[PDB]
Each structure stands twice: as C-alpha cells, then as structure tokens.
Amino acid sequence: ASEAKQTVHTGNTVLLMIKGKPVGRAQSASGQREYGTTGVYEIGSIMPQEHVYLRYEGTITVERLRMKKENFADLGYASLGEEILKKDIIDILVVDNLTKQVIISYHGCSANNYNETWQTNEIVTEEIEFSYLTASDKA
Amino acid sequence: ASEAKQTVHTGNTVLLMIKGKPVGRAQSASGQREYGTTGVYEIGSIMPQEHVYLRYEGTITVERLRMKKENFADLGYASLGEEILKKDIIDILVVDNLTKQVIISYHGCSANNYNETWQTNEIVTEEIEFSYLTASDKA
Amino acid sequence: ASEAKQTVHTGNTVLLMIKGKPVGRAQSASGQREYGTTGVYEIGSIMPQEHVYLRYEGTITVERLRMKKENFADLGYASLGEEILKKDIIDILVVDNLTKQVIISYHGCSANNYNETWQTNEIVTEEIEFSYLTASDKA
Amino acid sequence: ASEAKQTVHTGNTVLLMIKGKPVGRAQSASGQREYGTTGVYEIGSIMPQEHVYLRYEGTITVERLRMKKENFADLGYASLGEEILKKDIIDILVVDNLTKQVIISYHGCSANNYNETWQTNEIVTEEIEFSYLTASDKAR
Amino acid sequence: NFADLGYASLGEEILKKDIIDILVVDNLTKQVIISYHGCSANNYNETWQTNEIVTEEIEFSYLTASDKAR
Amino acid sequence: ASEAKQTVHTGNTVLLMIKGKPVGRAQSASGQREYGTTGVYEIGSIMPQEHVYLRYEGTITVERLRMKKENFADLGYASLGEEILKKDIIDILVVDNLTKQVIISYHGCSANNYNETWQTNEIVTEEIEFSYLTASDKAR
Amino acid sequence: AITSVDSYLLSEIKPRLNTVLENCYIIDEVLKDFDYQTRESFKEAFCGKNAQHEVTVGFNFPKFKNNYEAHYLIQLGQGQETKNSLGSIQSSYFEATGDTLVESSTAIREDDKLVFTVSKPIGELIKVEDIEFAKYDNLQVEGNKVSFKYQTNEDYENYNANIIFTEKKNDSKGLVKGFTVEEQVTVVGLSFNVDVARCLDAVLKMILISMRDSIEEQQTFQLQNLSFGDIAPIIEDGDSMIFGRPTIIKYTSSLDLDYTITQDINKLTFKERKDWK
Amino acid sequence: AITSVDSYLLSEIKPRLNTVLENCYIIDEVLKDFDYQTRESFKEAFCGKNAQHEVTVGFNFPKFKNNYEAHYLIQLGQGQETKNSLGSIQSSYFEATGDTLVESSTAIREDDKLVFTVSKPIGELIKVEDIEFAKYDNLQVEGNKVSFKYQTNEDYENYNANIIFTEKKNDSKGLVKGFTVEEQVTVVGLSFNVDVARCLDAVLKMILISMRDSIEEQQTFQLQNLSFGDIAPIIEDGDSMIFGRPTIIKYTSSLDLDYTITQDINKLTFKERKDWK
Amino acid sequence: AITSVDSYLLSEIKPRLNTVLENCYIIDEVLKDFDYQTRESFKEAFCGKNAQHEVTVGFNFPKFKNNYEAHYLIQLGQGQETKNSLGSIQSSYFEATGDTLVESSTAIREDDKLVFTVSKPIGELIKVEDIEFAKYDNLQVEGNKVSFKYQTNEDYENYNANIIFTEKKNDSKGLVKGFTVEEQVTVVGLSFNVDVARCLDAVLKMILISMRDSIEEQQTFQLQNLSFGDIAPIIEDGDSMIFGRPTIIKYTSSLDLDYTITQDINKLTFKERKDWK
Amino acid sequence: AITSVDSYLLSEIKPRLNTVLENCYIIDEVLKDFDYQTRESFKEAFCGKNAQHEVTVGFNFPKFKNNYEAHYLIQLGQGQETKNSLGSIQSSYFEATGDTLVESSTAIREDDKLVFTVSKPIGELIKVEDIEFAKYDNLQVEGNKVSFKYQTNEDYENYNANIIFTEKKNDSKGLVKGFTVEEQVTVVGLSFNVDVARCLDAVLKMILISMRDSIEEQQTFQLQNLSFGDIAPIIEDGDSMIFGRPTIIKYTSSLDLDYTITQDINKLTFKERKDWK
Amino acid sequence: RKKRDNFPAEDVQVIVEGNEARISMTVYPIRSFKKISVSLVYKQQTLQA
C-alpha cells in the first residue's frame, strides 16, 4: 500500500544534485535561514507595535565521506588554496528521488569553510559550508 | 473512569491549528515570553524597592516532519527567499482536541528563521520560529 | 519509628501554597539568592581587607505540569499579554505538610518570564520565574 | 508585516537616486539642517522674549562601497582635482522603492569633501559630503 | 512625519511656521505632566541605513516650561 | 564571486605602488580631499544663494608594518632629519592588481609627518602622511 | 481515582468490536492491504449480521473452554509510578466532582427561559455543544438544569445539543492526593488459523486508534503506547496449534484519593489586650 | 535508629485494613471503577461488620496453613546504602531525643496558668495545635507539662488541643552517626479467586496512598515508591490455582546510632609563665 | 492505512525473484564474487528458462512439506510505535485519496485538445512524465482524464507518457489520525546445500536493494534497515541438515485511519440585537 | 558489488598460509616469543618444503573428516548495515568500471612511441609505477594499451613497470546504489595439541596483519577489526580433546548494484510560439 | 540571470522525448485595438473651508 495523503521525506527519498551530477555518499545537508526580524517599540506601551524584516541570511552545510575520487576538491567545488578566488557561484538542487522533481534550490552558493578529518577507526569525512544568495522551490 | 478535577494536557490532547487547518505531523511547539522586569534600587538600602515591567517579548517555535505536500513552504506560511516581504501576519491557535476549544492564541506571528535538515537515517525535519505581537486565552 | 533529631525535607513533605490554595502537580521550586559581596583591596597588600554587601537579588522558579484547569494563567498569577501590567505582587509560601507550618516565605513576587512546551510523547509543562522583594522564615 | 504594510520606512523601502539613475551599493545617507535660531533678550527679564531664524545651512553626506566601475569619480558626480571647477550643482533624490514616488529632494548639492580608504581585508569605501541650497517634499 | 504633519521644516517654509506647545502626558489619566511652551525648531536631522529603521531627530528651543497646560 | 567578477574593489583587488615598485606589507591607505566650499549670503534671504570653491587641499596617509629592509627610510621615501630638505615630490599610485591599470594617482606628494611605534609583543608599525598637489584617474 | 486498566479495556473493546463486525464496509476498508482471498474469507466468516462465526473477548485464566477460532485474551501487566507532585497534591477542589459525562439534550421553553435538562446534578459545565453565550444571555446553572434566556433566542426554542459536564458528589473541600502510574496490559488475538490471527491483529490496531479519541482515555489513561510481539504458537500439542500475535498497550494514568477537609474558617476576629508590665 | 521496614508495614497495614473493611462506603468508593458484580460480591463477602469472610496479613514462611481466600503476604526485600554524610554525622544533639509523638490533651487552670499535661517528658515541643503564642503569653515547658499564662486566656480554660512533641531519653551530648539506605519490601494479595486478587490490589494501593501522610513515614521511611508485577498463579498444582499480583514498596530511610560524648569542658583557665632563657 | 509488511514482502519478492531467475546475466553479475564452481552450479541448476529446479517463497507454519532445496521463508516479527503527531493528526484532506499509481498512457486528439486517459478517477496528479506545462497549455484534469491544449502541440498528437497519480475514493473532509510504527520481518533462505544458502542470501540482498526504489516503500515502508544472522542448521536430525542464514528487514511506516468530518459550514450570518437594559 | 567475506578470506588465507609455511625463517621470526621447544617442534613438523604434516583451510560443516592435527575452520558470522548515503547513491559513473587490477608490464617501442600492453581494456589508469608524465610526454590510453612518447625517453625503451588500473565493462551511464555493511567472520585453528593451537593463532595473526595492505581489503573490506576468544576444547569426548582459540575478523564494506540509466539527452532545441490571446 | 543582466515560469513549457528536449516559450505580438471599454464611476466629495 502506498498513500500520498500522508508522506514525509527521508534520507532515501531525496537526491542531492550539483551541476546535474548526484553527490555520492553525502551524509547530511543542513539549510538555515534568517530574516533579521526586528520589533518596533515606542513611548506609550511596552508592547511590540510591529515587526520588520531587515536582512536576509542563509547557509547550506553538507557533510560527506571523503571518496578516493570526485571529492569536492576533485570536482572543483571546494577550494584548498588561493584558487577559491577563481570559483564561480554554483546552484545546489535537492531533488525528489522518485519523480526527479526539484524540492528546493539553493542559488548562488559560495564557500565559507572546508574541513577534512583523518582518523584511525573511521572513514574520512568532508564537510563544507556555503553562503547562498537565495533559495526557492517550484511546483 | 474519567475525572475532570485533575487532568493535564498531553501531546494527544491538543490540536495545533493555523488558518483553520490542523498542522499534521507537528512534533513540538514551544512558547516563550518575557516582560523585562527591572528592579529599582536607591541610596539608603541594598534591598529592591520595586519591580517594573518595561518590554514585552515572546516567540513561538514549531518543529515538524517535512511532509511531501503542505509543508510550511507549500502552505505559504514559511518563506525561502525575498517573498518573506509579502507574507502578512498569521494567528496560531492551540486548541483542545476533545472540546475544540481554544487553549491559547498567539496573535501576529512573524517568521524569524526557517530550517530544514536532510539526513540519511532519519525523516526530514522542518523547524520555524515566529515573533508574535501578543498571546491570549478566552474562556 | 519516627525521629526528629535527624530529618530532611523531601518532595512529599512540603506543600507549596499561593493565596491559601495549594498548587497541584508542581514539579519543582528553585529559590536563588545573591548579596553582591564585594571584596575591598588596597595598596600595601594583596589580601582582601574586608567584604561588603551591596545589592540583594533573588528569584523563585516553579515548574508545573499544565493542568486543564487552574493553570497559572487561569489562576491569574501568570500573564500572557499586556494584562501583566495589572497583576499585583503575590506572596509564595512553602509549608510543612505535616504541621502546616511555614518553612519559608517569598514576599513580593513579580513575574519575569512564562513558558509552555507542547510535545508529542509528554505531558505539557508550565514554567514560571518571579523576582521577589525579600524572603523570610518564622519560628 | 508585509513591506506594503509597514508603518516605518526602512532601508529596503527606499532608494537613492541621482540624475534619474539608482545609486548602487549605497551604505548610508545623513541629512542635516540648521536655521541659525537665536534667542532675543532684553533688560527687565532673564528669559528669551522670542526666537528668530537667521541663516539656513544644510549638508547631505553619502557613503558607499567603492565599485570597480560607476564610482562617483567615474560617473562624474565627484572631483579629484581642477575638474571640481567644471562641475555644476546637482539634485539628489530619496525615493520610495515600491512606487518610485519622491520622498525627499535635496536641491543644488555642491561637494564639500571626498574621501577614500583602502584596507587589507575589507571592501573599499567611498564617502562624499555635499552642501545644498534647499530641500523639499517634491522634485524640482 | 514631522515634515508631513507640518511640525518641521526643510526649506523656506521655516519662516511660515509659528511656535508650538509640546506636552508630556500621563498615559492613564491624560493629565499633563510637563508642558514646553513656545517651541521653535533649532535643527532637523535624518539618517538612512542599509538594514535599519529610518530615524528622525528634531531639536526645539522653547520659551518656558510649566507643570500645567497654557 | 570570482575576483574577476566582483563588483566592488577589495584590498586584494588593488596594489599600492611608488616609483614603479609595489609597496609591500601595506596595511592601509587613506585619501582625503577638501575644496574650501563656502556659502554666500546676502541681506533679504536667510538661505545661501550659491556655493563657491575657494582652496583645494588634500592628504594621503599610508600605514605599514615595518620591514627589516626596504622601509620608507631605507627606500628613501621618508626622512628622519636634514635629509628632508633633499627629498623631492613623488607620485603614489593605487593600481588594479589584475591588469596593473592605474586606479588613482596622487601627484606631487610631500611628507607631513612620519611615525614609528615599538611594542613588546607586536609587529612594528610605520605610518606616514603626505600632502599632495592633485589627484587624477590616470598617471602623469 | 483508583483505576483498573484491564476492565476499562474489556468494557471499551467489546462494544467497538461488535459494532465494527456488524458493519461490512469498515472491515473492507481495514483489510484493504491483505490478500484478496484472506480478506474475503474473513469477511464471509466473521463479518456482517449473518456471520455464523463470532469473535469473543475476556480475561485470561477462565475455567472453561474458549472460542479458539477467534478470541481476544486480555492480560493485565506490569506498571510503575513515574511522576509525583509536591506534597503529593494532584489537585484541589471546593466541590467534590465525579466523572465526566456527555449527554444529548434538547432545549425547552420555561417561563421565558430556555433550559436544558441533564440526568444528574451538574458539578461543572464544560461545554454546551455549538453555543458560546454572551453575558446578555444570562447563562445560569442550577441543580441538574442549565438555563438560558429566551427573549432573543426564540428561534432556538427546540434546539438540540450535547452537554459535556461532570457530576458532583457533595459540597465539600479537600485535596486530591495521589501520583501517576505507567501501566501495561497485553492483548492477544488467538486463532488456530494464522490468517485469522493476522486479521484480528489488524482489527485490534484499528480499534485502539479509534479509542484514542474517547473521553475515557482523553481524561484518564493518557499517552497510549503500543508494542507488538512475534506471531507464534501459543499452544503446540493439541490436534492443531493455536497461534497469536501479542500487543502491549501502555497507559499513563493517575492514582489518587479524595482527602476531604472538615476544617472551615468563616470569621476572623480581632482583640486588643493591654500589657501594663 | 535501626529500623525494620517489614514490621513497620505489618503494624501499619493491619489496623488500616481492618478500619477500611469495617466501613462499607470506603470500599464502595475504592471499587467504583470495577465491574458492578465484582464490586458487590467483594462488598458482600469481605466488607462490613457482618462480613463472614476475612482478610489476613502476615510475613512469609509460616509453618501453618493460611487463609488463601484473601491474604496479604509481606516479604522483606533488597536494599543498598545511597547517601552518606561527611564524617558520617547525620546530626548532633545536646539532649538525647526519642520518637516523635502526637497526643490529644486539654487545658486546665493551675495557679493562674493554663497547662497541658503530656504522658511523657517533653524533649522538644514541635507544635501545640491551632495555637501560636506571643511573648506575653510566657510559654514555658517543664518536665512532661506545657504551661501557658491564664490572665488574658480565661475563655480557653478548657480548650482541647493536640500536642506534637518528642520524647527525651536523657540529658547527654552526642553525635548521630549513620547513613541513608534505600530498601524494598514486596507485598502480594493471595486469593484463589482472581477478582478478589484484583480487589485486594486496589485496596492495598489505597492504603499505601493513605499511609504516605502518616508521621511514621513522614519523619522516617521517606520517598515511598511503588512498582507492580503481573497477575500470575503463585501455586499451580493444588485442586485449584492461587493467584496474586505483587507490589514492591521502596523506601529511603536513615540507619544510625547515638554516639554519646562524655567529654565536657566547663571552664578555660589562663596562666602566664615567664621565659628567662 | 493499516498495513501488513509480511504480505507486502511476499507480493514484492515473488515476481522479482522470478524475473531475476529467468535472466542469466543478472545472476552472473550478482554472483561474480563467489567461487567459479559455486556460481556455475547455481546458474545451471536454478537459473534460466530451462531450469529444472526452482526456488519458492511463502510464510512460515505451513501444514505441507516445502521445497527444502531452496525456499525463502517469510516470518513476521516485532514492532513498536516510535513517533507521534500532536493530536495524532498525521495529515488532513479535503478529498478522500486512495493509493498512488503509475500507469502508461498515450495522448490522443479530441476536439482540438490532447488528452491522456487513465483507468481510474484522478484524485491528484503528481507528474506527467517528461512534461512541464505552461499556463498557455491550459492544463486541466477532469474525472479520469487529463486534458491538454492541441494548438501548439500538434507534433505530440500521439506522444507516449507515464502518469503518476493517486485515486480518489470520494469527496469528503476528514483527518488522517494515526502514528508511526517501526516493524521487523525475518526472511531466511533454506537449503540442504550450504552453497545454495549462501547464493540465496546474495540474491535476496540484491532484491532488497532493488526494492528500495519502488513506489510502495518510497511512499510507505520507509527507512529499510537490514541485519544478518549466522549461517546455521535450521533442522539437524533428518537424513541431512537444513541450513539457512536469516536476514531481518526493518521498516518505518504509518498506521492511520480516515476520520471523516460530516460537519460543514457554508454561510456565516450576522444579526444585531438591542439591549434596552 | 555484492561480496562474500568468507570466500574472500578462504581465497586469501590459503596461498599466504602456504607461502609462509614453505619459508622457514618467517616462522622462526613469528614464533620468536614462544618457548624454544614449542618453536622447534612446530618448525620441524609443519614448516619447510620437507614438512611431513600439513595445515588445511576450509569452511565449517563438511561431510568428511578433517585434518584435526591442524586445521583453520572458517565460519561466516553476523552483520548489520551501518551507514547510508542520501538517495542511497554510493557513487555515479559515466563508464561501467570493473575490478581494480595490478599487472607487471614492459615498455616497447612502436612507431616512435613507447607503449605498455595490459591484458584487459583499461577503464581507468590509476598509476604507472615510478613514472609521473609531463604534458610534453603526450600520455594517452587507448583500448588495452598505454602509450608514451619515445623522443626524449629512448633510454627507457625496455623499462619494466607495474600498472595499477581497473577494467571497463561497457560504455554506459548509471548510479551505484547501495549501502555499507559491517560483517563478522570467525576463524579457529583446531588442533589436538594445545601448543599447535597456540602457534596457529600466532601465524593467523601475522597473516591478517600482512593482509591489511592488500588491494582487496584496501579498496573493499576496510577497517579490519580483530577479537580473540579463550582457548578451550572444541570437542571433548573422543579418545582425545580437540582445542582451538577463536578469532573474529570484522570488516566494513559496501553492498551495491549498478543501476544503469538508458536515458540520454544530446540536444536542447528552442522554439518561440506566439500568444494572440 | 539574463533578464537581471538585461522570464515567467508559468510561460515556458518543456517536453523531453527520445534524447531530445523541446523548450517552447510563449511570446506576445503587437495587435491593434478594436474595442475600448470605459467604466465611469461618479463619486462625490466633501469640500471644507
């Protein structure tokens, strides 16, 4: 039995795609978003009178097992040195695995930091964080 | 046996409603509230003489499993991009499941931040936080 | 056998009373207190010469399961909105359950913050914090 | 609240415009105004009998991040040397971002000073100050 | 705004203003706490910022003050 | 964005150059400019009838970490004593780091003051201020 | 109160089980995921008014033989106290209140009031269905009657409502003293046919989901939590095996007593007495 | 002191059980949630002064046959020490104090004082019920009597009170040395009728809730915590099975001894002695 | 819905197992890591259309003898509820929606529209394969047909597509009430040849990996998690031993019911009534 | 791929065990910590080309009698899936790639290129041993040959190298879908002589340490983890006991399938269509 | 990106078939008015002095 009226996304239901290639062995993606909502106050009451949006901010963080090939460094999306200055912005798509249909797009991603951890009883882990210009979904 | 003289609310006893639709698969709601209570001191004693209320503040935070349909983004209550600038304030009602009777109303909610986490052994989670203008109950 | 020469208070031994009604289903009470003790130093030694008391401060924090009736909001002790401006100070008594004898009184309580948490596998929890003008015991 | 419903102006609700083109990367603008208001006193009272306006003066300051093109120097709104003598007075508008209705015009702006700063690990900044003749709720 | 309400001036119109009374008033009773009498503007100031609410500041000189309205 | 695509200049996108050699360890540069702009008033109005330019003045300040060699004193761009009288005016260029196209020239710089500071646990610093005659979008 | 989860479950399951089994399309919806032949055989055998077989419910350890074709065995399990109140005060009351009740009623005119009559004295009124009264309506409760002003409401002179209320025992003060317990009951659907055991499991899960909305376990017996065992032979050495799949139903509930207080104080009085030392 | 939780429970349960069983409306309230026939059968058999059957209480391992129709078997369990004091000093005293007691008494006039007489020497007075004395009242205690000034209090010349106090053993100093123990006792209501076992469980839970307020386990035996077992056959191979549902009662309590100190010092004395080197 | 993981697994495994076994190069790829002789013997015996032996699938506890040469025994296991919604509201709907379906279809011209016909009434359209319509295309759905403007699309007059959609039961409002359960099923490949057991293990793991992409366990039965037991003799005292290696398949899934709401409100009305006091 | 840890271990252990046992000084180094007589007796009996006894390796549950003097019994154990990828995408490929291989080869001149020939089509070249080519060297791969410019390299016209590469199956796109499993295999050295069991333990630990560097368990079967049991009698009721010391080898490895994608898109095309409304 | 430097998502259609994707935009040509419809509303206004 398969019902649409209730369904949730799960780690198996969702592809992560960059430049039209799926990212293998991605372990998590975390999208965060902030609007700078500021409350308005005045002489005459303690209550907030209004809220205003002042500054949009957001980041996408991805953790991945470091493959022997097609790393973020080998794919070119990450940067180890000064060549960060030569990477154009990229768009990261999160896509429904069944329908191949875009769930959410992160547009204009730009790398904040890049980590690798080498440890003796574990698989090596990549982690990367991007600032992005906007996010959207289409339906 | 069913007694009213003692009873507590529980996760099963309480509906969460927005715009007259119940929010499916909501995992938690957290309401927080602050009055800015400031103590008055003077030359002549170490004791507080008085307390005064100076600034009301409060937030409602909701965690939810990301459904395949009727997300906060699909419902329009959340915002991913600049369209946050076009969302009017909304009222969030917490309602008794048995009597359909309003327990508490959060009025004038306005989004502070919106998160989605995609992870490999888990259901995807939405979380959203609103600032609100006031809260009330009616009986 | 029942001995007075050693005895400790326990969760079952102590009533919490407000306005002459016991508070049902209270889960904890935490009383905290500070005197601003400041050390005096001078040219000629590294040692403190004296200590002085400069500013008394204290709070009482109460956690409670949210009942369906006689909440702090229904009792009127808590405030959800601007009506906080119309609540007079209240005195909170902690009382020996056996003798009905006052253990400690918190005088002039005034609310700092009020929380409610709605969660899916748990009973709903109230929590409230008051600043108070003084505390005392009588014997 | 929606941007269409806010009671207060905010930086996103307004635009800065010169000669009909929007000023990009504008960080701040500060407008100051003085009337020379002077109190009159006389023998027989310690208190001012009235106040009178004497001399209007006003300055508008604009600060920006320096762009690689279309700077004030590149657009010809600022001067570095002799060319200041060949400038002429300009009007600066602050404008409603939704409707493009004018909020304030500053009329007859003329530059007082122009300033630049370069830093190891920061965006380059421009600041300019104009004195102006008059201001109005409307365009000229 | 002060400019929209006619309590402030941007240009020549300052000459056509006249002196005003400013009251600070008890919010409960609407009883006057302080009157400032015969206020006349000294300066008027505005500031615009990328990600903040716009601000107005105005300074008036005044003739006298009283515990009561005129 | 790529450095080739940024709309704003940043410290890494620009170079500071004197006599055709890059100034190493440059921490900051500040360029200031004044025109002496003065408002004219007359009987019959409280408002300035026009503004006029009177006296150009400008100064360029440069701050650096002191190197063990090729300091301003070692390179001969600064003076400690009588030798100031035997200096002559120099041109200071701010230059696009990619193309080596000039962004600003300061012409005829002459030193106003020169300053040094030594600290227990910090890098030594140099600061120098030049007054200059003119500035231009181009080299002389 | 003191409570008995096993007897609650027996009393609640038996009527619900009967009312599902007498209603074919409910079973046809519950069993939609099973194999077609399993579904049709179950519906033919046990379901509808003409059903020749029957299901049964009862506690464990009877002295007689049961309907081992299909039988829900109810089996009281473990529990432990989990949360305590300060002073063990679960609540306090000014008027001894009984169980919560919901009753259908109709308005009638009486002396230019509308009134609803209820079978028992109203200790507290929680809700008159689909009505919120204004102060002008002069809502009053008295004895076992709710009363409501006629003047503006004449169109509703025969309005039909449900009243949610609770009994009063008596006018007395006291403290509800007690604690919360978390307690388990096991239920197993026995059948010598494995496909019947699997269908009885499905029907029981449906019944428990439906039960979660009932007033009984909304007010008491909160936080129903379900666990499920393997399907296994319960008895293995007859002429045939008997199969079942256990389920454990866990509930959180209050155990408490009405400690009445006889002491009442109705006047302070003040006196001054003089110390001549 | 050293304590014996099992003998405390036996001594406390037996009178309480008797006083509930001789009082029909208490059982009628306790069993309100059970099936009507279960309730009425239990109340007919075991309850009221005319009851022909009887319940019984005793420790495990007797050499004789018990009343297996209804019997509370008490069964001392495990424990462990949980919290220790620095130096193992649980307390200290200037006057060796005995058990806490509550006694009814009446005032009498004597020599223009009011006095209350108590059966034993008062080591400490905790409370005179419903009275708070002022300094003017010249409250004094002496031996086994409490004494109270008559002058302003003549209306109370025969006032009836309860005195809460504690004995004194002797006038001696010492340290109460000991530690806290957390200890378990099991209780099971045996019956060959399962519905009787379930009712005995309900009655025992009511009794323990009522017990929580007693002075014995307010001063000692604190933090009563209850756990409940499955209902099961305790014995299975008679002409009939015997059923029971265990409950475990856990208590936190102090084990300690009075280490008396004989050393006393009643004068310092000072001397100067001169060093001529 | 209510769900039956065991019957899902049986229904899903049987066709997939058949379609792999009738396709030699799939087995030749799956068994590439095994010893050459093991691989060739398995492929000769069980694989291809000419295969003289056969594998079989069925539930445990049949009354007949099975094909102990190679048999997948399916064995329903434990489960527990894991996550609950506030108010138990799993979802809500304005139109009662059935199962998700995928069907092949072809466009046809009709009255200068293109239309796709579907076997059942479309409750919701999720995707028309490989098409994204513009507003100009005037996409409309009606009954069991999808309709699409002809004018600009004449080249596609016979275009072949797959429609992903879901049934509607009826036009009614309600709440989907329920919870999530995590549940286990065991599967074991029995063979009296140990190398056959090891190959059946490999084939089953391949089948389950392939199953993860199916709509059935994308929409329901999510988060498949696999555990593997030791290889051991299942039966030890025949003329030969029977071996198997268990695997446990764990799924997370929703149990829920359609609580329909009959109440509907279609007009507010306002009245002013005057209070003369 | 699908993998079989037991058959890997058998295939890897057998040649390594033979090559150690035919080489006396290796055993003389491995057993340096044992008693002199134990060492010399083991080396005399089992070691060197003249050894009259022999060790043996095989899976458990054979139908025949084994060499109980010294026998490594391999015994497939438990496992569980541990880490999953988003979308279960373990990787993706544009060209179906086989196993990794290392082969010895020699350069030859051909048409003023140097070439290395490899036994199979090169799907990817990982390393030519001890060479890093410059762009001037015009490194190219074609079919099963690697080719390398002669002009500057004439001194290397017969250079001997090892090529590390991997096969290609075919030119096709797809997704590697699967997951990671952590899996256990037990190995025990059986002997009726306890000192032989202890020496077989030492030799096996040496072999596994040496195995950690092999390409097989560098690319797959990663994170080898070893646990060791007590020495005990495996069989106790013959004319003599049989002893062994178990070791458990745990590996982390990927289970996955090549899901090929047939869909390919090789041209977008654009059209403008006009809306006259 | 292009229209920022220099199209509505509702106005582009995509069909993929047989390794080929046809992307079809709507476009609006210039017509000529044949109808003018004027809705004239008479309000009234309070003057004050």
Side-chain angles (χ1 to χ4, degrees), chain D residues 84-139:
Chain D
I84 186 62
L85 298 177
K86 288 187 286 282
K87 303 307 178 189
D88 60 2
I89 68 184
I90 67 177
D91 304 332
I92 302 183
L93 289 82
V94 175
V95 171
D96 181 65
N97 188 20
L98 175 65
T99 66
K100 278 65 171 183
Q101 178 173 40
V102 61
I103 302 163
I104 291 185
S105 305
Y106 304 97
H107 301 282
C109 299
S110 182
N112 291 30
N113 59 71
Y114 177 53
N115 181 337
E116 292 149 320
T117 291
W118 319 89
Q119 292 294 117
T120 52
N121 307 103
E122 295 193 344
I123 306 160
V124 178
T125 61
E126 292 185 301
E127 176 184 45
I128 193 159
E129 178 179 7
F130 308 88
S131 47
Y132 65 87
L133 302 179
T134 67
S136 311
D137 303 318
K138 61 178 67 177

Side-chain angles (χ1 to χ4, degrees), chain H residues 171-213:
Chain H
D171 302 342
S172 69
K173 292 158 45 181
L175 303 172
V176 183
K177 287 179 176 172
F179 59 104
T180 61
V181 181
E182 186 172 7
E183 188 162 36
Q184 292 170 206
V185 179
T186 308
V187 182
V188 60
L190 303 176
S191 184
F192 60 72
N193 187 337
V194 179
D195 271 2
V196 176
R198 293 163 68 258
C199 294
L200 292 171
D201 193 40
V203 173
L204 180 59
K205 288 180 306 201
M206 179 280 292
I207 286 167
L208 292 169
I209 291 164
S210 181
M211 277 166 50
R212 279 185 156 125
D213 299 346

Side-chain angles (χ1 to χ4, degrees), chain J residues 79-97:
Chain J
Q80 192 173 10
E81 78 172 83
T82 186
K83 294 191 173 190
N84 297 356
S85 303
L86 289 175
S88 286
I89 306 311
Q90 298 291 88
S91 284
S92 176
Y93 61 93
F94 294 92
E95 179 168 27
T97 294

Side-chain angles (χ1 to χ4, degrees), chain D residues 14-26:
Chain D
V14 304
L15 291 175
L16 178 66
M17 306 196 79
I18 301 179
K19 293 182 181 284
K21 296 193 295 185
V23 178
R25 306 296 97 100

